[PDB]
Amino acid sequence: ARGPKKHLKRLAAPHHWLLDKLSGCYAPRPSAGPHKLRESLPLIVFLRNRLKYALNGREVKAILMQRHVKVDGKVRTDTTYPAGFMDVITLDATNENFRLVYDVKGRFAVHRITDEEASYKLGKVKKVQLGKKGVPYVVTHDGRTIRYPDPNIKVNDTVKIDLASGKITDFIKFDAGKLVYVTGGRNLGRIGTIVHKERHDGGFDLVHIKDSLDNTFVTRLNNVFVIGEQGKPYISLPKGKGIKLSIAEERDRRRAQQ
Amino acid sequence: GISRDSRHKRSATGAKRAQFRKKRKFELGRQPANTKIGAKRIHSVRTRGGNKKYRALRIETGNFSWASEGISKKTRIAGVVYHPSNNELVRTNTLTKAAIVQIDATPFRQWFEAHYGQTLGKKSKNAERKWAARAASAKIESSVESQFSAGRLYACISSRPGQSGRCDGYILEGEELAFYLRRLTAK
Amino acid sequence: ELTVQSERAFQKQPHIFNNPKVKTSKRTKRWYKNAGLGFKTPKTAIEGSYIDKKCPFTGLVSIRGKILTGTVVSTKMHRTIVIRRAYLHYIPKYNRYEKRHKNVPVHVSPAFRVQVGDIVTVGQCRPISKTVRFNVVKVSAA
RNA sequence: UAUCUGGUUGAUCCUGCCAGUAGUCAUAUGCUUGUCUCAAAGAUUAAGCCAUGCAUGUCUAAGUAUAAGCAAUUUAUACAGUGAAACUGCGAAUGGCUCAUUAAAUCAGUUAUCGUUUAUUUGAUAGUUCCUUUACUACAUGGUAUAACUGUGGUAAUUCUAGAGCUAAUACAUGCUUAAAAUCUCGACCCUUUGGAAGAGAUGUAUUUAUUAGAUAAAAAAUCAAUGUCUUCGGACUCUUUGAUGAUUCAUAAUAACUUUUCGAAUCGCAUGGCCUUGUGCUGGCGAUGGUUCAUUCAAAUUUCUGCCCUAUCAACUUUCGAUGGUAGGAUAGUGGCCUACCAUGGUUUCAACGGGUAACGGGGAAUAAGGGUUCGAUUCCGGAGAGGGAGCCUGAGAAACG
RNA sequence: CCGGUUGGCCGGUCGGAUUUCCAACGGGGCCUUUCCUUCUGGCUAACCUUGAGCUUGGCGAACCAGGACUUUUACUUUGAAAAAAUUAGAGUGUUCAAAGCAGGCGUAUUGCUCGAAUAUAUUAGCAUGGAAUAAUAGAAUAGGACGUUUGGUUCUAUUUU
RNA sequence: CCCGUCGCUAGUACCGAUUGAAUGGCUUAGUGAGGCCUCAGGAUCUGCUUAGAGAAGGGGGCAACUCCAUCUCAGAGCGGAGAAUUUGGACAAACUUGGUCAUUUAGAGGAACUAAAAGUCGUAACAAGGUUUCCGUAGGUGAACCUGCGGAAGGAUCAUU
RNA sequence: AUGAUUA
RNA sequence: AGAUAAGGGAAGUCGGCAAAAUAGAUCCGUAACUUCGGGAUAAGGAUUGGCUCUAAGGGUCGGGUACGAUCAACUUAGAA
RNA sequence: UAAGGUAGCCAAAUGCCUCGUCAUCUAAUUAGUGACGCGCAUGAAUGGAUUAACGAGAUUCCCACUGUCCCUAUCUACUAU
């Protein structure tokens, strides 16, 4: 439409932000950033509709502008910045550190953690190439662009980063039998320990994935996110850890605590 | 303006599409260049995304490569003598890509003399050693040697001067040289 | 496919400079590439004297995307043919199908010799012309 | 909640229609109308015409301020507080309105960009710019307006404008400032002839062209053109280096040149700190602005497969003067008859092409029902189109823009 | 033969849950002329490998990278995917209801906490287990498959010399 | 019970001289604005290079004579930006003229159809309807209709070993 | 040969 | 006997009588009606010079048991 | 009455009255055309009704064109003199 869009109505904003269909006919458009529009949680909806730390967008803008807030160790004083997947946010006041991960019900969770657990994160490599002057480099899922990594690091691997620089603390390779996390689709929030995969040369490599109740499924290799080895996650995980129990067990569950 | 789309053409079955939209800016075209020789004129044009586009006109000199030697020198241009697309470009002397032209041959000759020390047409220890080592490769073939006798050498333009502002190309050798001299001599 | 230099211009593979100075085996050079997706670049394309820059193997037209199969019905064009894509469109109300066809045109190299009725599979490449998007990669007759 | 009824006969059974019945985010109207909550609303005929008035402008600590604007510095002699107008920089291409056009066209799901542009964001990223490069030249930094304003003014009227005098910049036009090594060329000279060489020019990025590398299923022998490592010149010979892709002339590197020469900070705010060779010497922080390249993101444009109402009282359509392909070129941001030159005569069709009509924008959906389904969908969301009908074009990353 | 679902004596818990079980149901595997792709590799696997009953050495997919022949579909199962709103539907006293996605619980001064499911989604496109049904080509004037063989033609090609 | 002509009233559509009329779309040809692109144009402003003199000023042979700045004016080139105007091209609005396609519409008159409480002329059909009806084809006549040739039973016969 | 309308 | 006339255009006249206009060639386009053969040069429009070029169209002699040499016509198309 | 003009056609080159009546063409039309028909006196090989093509045939209108005309003027050759 004659140029880029700038506005966003409600009901075109995604579902998993859980924004209400009343309260004004406009929605927060994620300004461009290190994550996409849809698989991203803006800081306005974060502070205003996950924590209730503010009540009005002016107040959230007040907080972000007076710099009580900081994501990835930087203030980031824009009201509609995409706080995407896996990312870290640090609040000096209350000394909290939120981590942005998924839950099995298909929503952006709120993962409370400490300052040292904030100082490292995880990032799936999105691709690898050779930059100018013969400098091999890679680029992750959070717009982070990193130079001179290990030659062992190839595509679909994961890296653990220092957050004071963009350099690497260490890496994790891709192979059969590694703990993962899913990000995209019906499987949003699962945690499922690779059993095998399949190639289909020409497009759409698929991966067989199962969580610890033996329960399996299949997902696209660009929707998965590998988090380490079986047993230990490399980070802390939210309540449930990606299981997707039945509807009836959860009804009975709620009827047990009431 | 000149469009570049297919909403003004017919479909493949034979149906005049209807007029549905107005012409756009992301479907435009522009006039040809009709690039000539002498008194270098390079207008630049603003394009989609800034990204300037030096529309050559009247271009007098250009770059030319000799690929068996890998060298590349600046040279004048006598004129075009063959163009596969149109003899009109040949006659009217308009430089484009794939264009068979004649060049001065003086930098290649003098470079050959300075590099190998071997005469055409018709002392120090270091230069003598250099030429003695580089021998057994001054034996290219008859057609290029004859053209160096004449002082007018056949080159193929491989640039797109209306898109780049550079008439650049390479000398013909061997097979396509023979092909183009056959095409030229057809009478 | 009788004569490689049929056209007025000089047909060749761009950038493939056969250097007269070096004297190596196989006097004239020819680039090629395996198209991918489990296809094979035939020995007729390797040994070929032709050029055909619009060919997927020796040329420059990457195959990527959809893949289709059909039977050839036209050959009356120059390095281009037309096939017929017989399929069955379903009607829920009447709960049963009906034959339909789509005559996709495709491009063909001299590397293949195709007569009518020869079932063939092809590949999505970039727009070769107003009508064409596909290029033939395997034939299934003789 | 899978329902029937009245009417042809003197009467009977049937076919068959009429009428009844129930509903509608289906409209109009009538008669009546006390309350809470929620809420459509000049679409249908005229995408017919419009008075008047609004609907997009915008600053910080931080681009430019002697407002001959306003408070008071008294921490400030250049201002350094606040601050209209104006230059500059962004945005004005989003939103909002309508549904006239349009029947493989838009559109919906689904592919590709190994075929392209992309402001802004987000992550990285310019020791190499003095070209007889030693006086050729300020680098504790260089040149020019011009607005606003002063006053002279001109038209009946206009968001009309001229003449004369200033002055500003992140506005224009220019412009140097930090190592060390390493290869090519020449090449003085010794001349050696196993051949060694002083001294001199280049190398960053970007554009354009050409070339080379960009790889690698397995193990031993005979030699040479000249030993190549070090020598018992019996030959031990290992050591050797290139990433991704389903797949590339991919990323990327290096040779040889092109360029009228791109970028490589003459910008701005706070706090003002340390070494002493005790100085306007040298270093030093947190930021804002902009900038060449790459990736990312918001996009954009083309694009694969499938699907659209009624019509044969529309059966052949397309190609003059592009229709189908090929070659070459121009143009494009890019592929491509998108356009041109030449050549081959192709391409679509009863599996409904092509032509006509449409009270046709499409879809997600809405009414109605046991099931199957029929009808509607301008209308809140997604994608299109348009600004009275058409055509053209400037600015910009992005318009064929109509505030 | 194996193991999963359904119940079933004994209830060995005071309407939940257990063993050998009489029974059914589909699943996984071996053999009966039933190769239902194997070469390089490393796991050598189930290891004939056995040290006294917790030991050194069986046939590579049961883990993988690559080659390879992979004759075709229609159908059907399962999954990925179908933007929200809408429809059906979980929970919720809008005081009921249309609605909406909220709310609830404290020592009510520090505060704590479950939600915002799930389903449908025509055709078409992708992977997927099946092999009934419908066609579909294969070997007949044999240019027919395995061939350790034995030649000749051909090019490619690593290790050394 | 029922048929048709003819007569009166009203409606609906058709044919029809009028090279009918208007409205809209597509369009050959001719003229062709306007921007854009290319060949020039050159008002105008502006930087550099000398360029000699009307003659002040000072410094030096202090006597003629010399050095440079100055208000002044030609004259010459070396350039930068540069509008009006201009050639050619592609985009192509609009007008004129024809053609064609559709949508309504006028019309002397001609020939139909339908509706009308009680019009005229007959009596064709329903009984063997008083010449059995009907089907096709052809001719005839005020009108129904009659007649010829073949056909049917929906006939007035299921029937003559 | 024909027996007007309505019941 | 031959010609030309501004503006108008058959108003002249029994009547467009006389005169004008049209005119070759190439390309485009072509109605009703019809005995299906025609109407048809229907109607109606465009182009045409000079010069310099370019493209196609041929004849005959030549090959161990694809191509060359040589000779001469105007036909048509296209561009500056 | 021998039998009473059938089909068809028309103010037609046949229609007196007659410049028939209606429509159209026109500003105006005894003209042209299309219709009506008790047709003085239409009519079937004394051939009726059409009819493409053809015509130095008769008639009407329209486009172009023009000294035919408004309204005449000028020029040339041959005469006249």
Domain with A212, as residue range(s), is 174-244
Chain H bases under 7 Å from protein CB? 53-55, 66, 79-80
- What are residue C82's DSSP bridge partners? C74, C105
Tell me if C88 sits within 8 A of C42, measured CB to CB. Answer: no
The technique by which this structure was obtained is cryo-EM
Resolution limit, Å: 3.3
- Is the CB of C20 less than 8 angstroms away from the CB of B183? no
**B35 CA, E21 C1': separation in Å?**
101
Domain-located, residue A61? yes
Tell me, yes or no, whether A186 and A85 share the same domain: no
CA distance B119 to B129: 17
Tell me, yes or no, whether A20 and A101 share the same domain: yes
Sign of CA dihedral A149, A151, A154, A157: negative
Tell me, yes or no, whether A49 and A130 share the same domain: no
**C130 CA, D339 C1': separation in Å?**
13
In this complex, whether A and B touch, counting 3 or more CB pairs under 8 angstroms, is no
Residue C76 burial by CB count (10 A; 0-12/13-18/19+): exposed, middle or buried?
A: exposed
Number of domains in chain A: 3
Chain C partners within 8 Å of A202 (Cβ): 36-38, 64, 67
How does DSSP classify residue C5?
A: T
**B80 CA, D86 C1': separation in Å?**
57
Strand order in the sheet with A96-99: A69-71, A88-91, A96-99, A111-113
In C 12-31, which Cβ lie closer than 7 Å to strand E?
25-26
CA distance A29 to A81: 9
Tell me, yes or no, whether A166 and A186 share the same domain: no
Residue in chain C closest to B98 (alpha carbons) equals C9
Domain-located, residue A62? yes
- Is the CB of C20 less than 8 angstroms away from the CB of B174? yes
Chain A partners within 8 Å of C67 (Cβ): 202
Chain C partners within 8 Å of B174 (Cβ): 20
Domain-located, residue A56? yes
- Is the CB of C12 less than 8 angstroms away from the CB of B176? yes
Q: Hey, what are A139's tokens? A: 């680029």
Tell me, yes or no, whether A195 and A221 share the same domain: yes
- What are residue A207's DSSP bridge partners? A197, A219
Domain-located, residue A252? no
Tell me if B140 sits within 8 A of C20, measured CB to CB. Answer: yes
- Is the CB of B84 less than 8 angstroms away from the CB of C19? no
Residue type, C88: L
b/e sequence A176-186, b meaning 16+ C-beta within 10 Å: eebbbbbbbee
Tell me, yes or no, whether A6 and A95 share the same domain: yes
Tell me if C121 sits within 8 A of C137, measured CB to CB. Answer: yes
Q: Is B145 an 8 Å CB contact of chain C?
A: no
Q: Which nucleotide is nearest to A202 (CA to C1')?
A: D246
Tell me, yes or no, whether A157 and A203 share the same domain: no
CA distance A94 to A53: 12
**C6 CA, H61 C1': separation in Å?**
30
Choose among B67, B84, B137: nearest Cβ to C8: B84
Choose among B6, B68, B180: nearest Cβ to C10: B180
Q: Hey, what are C68's tokens? A: 């289709």
- Is the CB of C9 less than 8 angstroms away from the CB of B174? no
3-state secondary structure chain B: CCECCCCCCECCCCCECCCCCCCCCCCECCCCCCECCCCCEEEEEEECCEEEEEEEECCCEEEEEECCCCEEEEEECCEEEECCCCHHHHHHCCECCCCEEEECCHHHHHHHHHHHCCCCCCCCHHHHHHHHHHCCCCCCCHHHHHHHHHCCEEEEECCCHHHHCCCEEEECCHHHHHHHHHHHHCC
Tell me, yes or no, whether A81 and A103 share the same domain: yes
For tokens 């009356």, what's the residue? C76
Tell me, yes or no, whether A196 and A148 share the same domain: no
CA distance C54 to A1: 35
Tell me, yes or no, whether A134 and A112 share the same domain: no
Nearest CA-CA partner of B138 in B130, B156, B77, B101? B130
Tell me, yes or no, whether A100 and A151 share the same domain: no
**B22 CA, D103 C1': separation in Å?**
19
CA distance A9 to A13: 7
3-state secondary structure chain A: CCCCCCCCCCCCCCCCCCCCCCCCCCCCCCCCCCCCCCCEEEHHHHHHHHHCCCCCHHHHHHHHHHCCEEECCECCCCCCCEEECCCEEEECHHHEEEECCEECCCEECCEEECHHHHHCCCEEEEEEEECHHHCEEEEECCCCEEECCCCCCCCCCEEEECCCCCCEEEEECCCCCCEEEECCCCCCCCCCCCCEEECCCCCCCEEEEEECCCEEEEEECCCEEEEECCCCECCCCCCCCCCCCCHHHHHHHHHHCC
Domain-located, residue A141? yes
Tell me if C136 sits within 8 A of C128, measured CB to CB. Answer: no
User: What angle is formed at CA A251 by the lines to CA A249 and CA A255, rounded to 5 degrees?
Assistant: 110
Sign of CA dihedral B31, B170, B147, B187: negative
Q: Write the residues followed by a gap in chain B (C–N more than 2.5 A).
A: 122
Q: Is A199 an 8 Å CB contact of chain C?
A: no
Q: Hey, what are A223's tokens? A: 């929707």
- Is the CB of C10 less than 8 angstroms away from the CB of B173? no
- Residue B146's φ and ψ, nearest 5 degrees, are -65, -40
Domain-located, residue A18? yes
Rg of the Cα atoms in chain B:
22
Sign of CA dihedral B83, B84, B89, B95: negative
Tell me, yes or no, whether A31 and A58 share the same domain: yes
The long-range contacts involving C16-20, CB below 8 angstroms and separated by at least 24 positions, are: C17/B67, C18/B175, C19/B67, C19/B68, C20/B68, C20/B140, C20/B141, C20/B173, C20/B174
Domain-located, residue A210? yes
Residue A90 Cα to chain centre, angstroms: 16
Tell me if B108 sits within 8 A of B98, measured CB to CB. Answer: no
Q: Write the residues followed by a gap in chain C (C–N more than 2.5 A).
A: none
Residue type, A195: V
For strand A179-182 and strand A196-198, is the pairing parallel, antiparallel, or unpaired?
Answer: unpaired
Q: Hey, what are B150's tokens? A: 């004449």
Nearest CA-CA partner of A81 in A71, A90, A67? A71
- Between A and C, how many residue pairs show a Cβ–Cβ distance under 8 A? 8
Residue A171 Cα to chain centre, angstroms: 18
CA dihedral A32, A36, A37, A38 (to 10 degrees): -170
CA distance B160 to B147: 26
Q: Hey, what are A163's tokens? A: 């957050």
Domain-located, residue A251? no
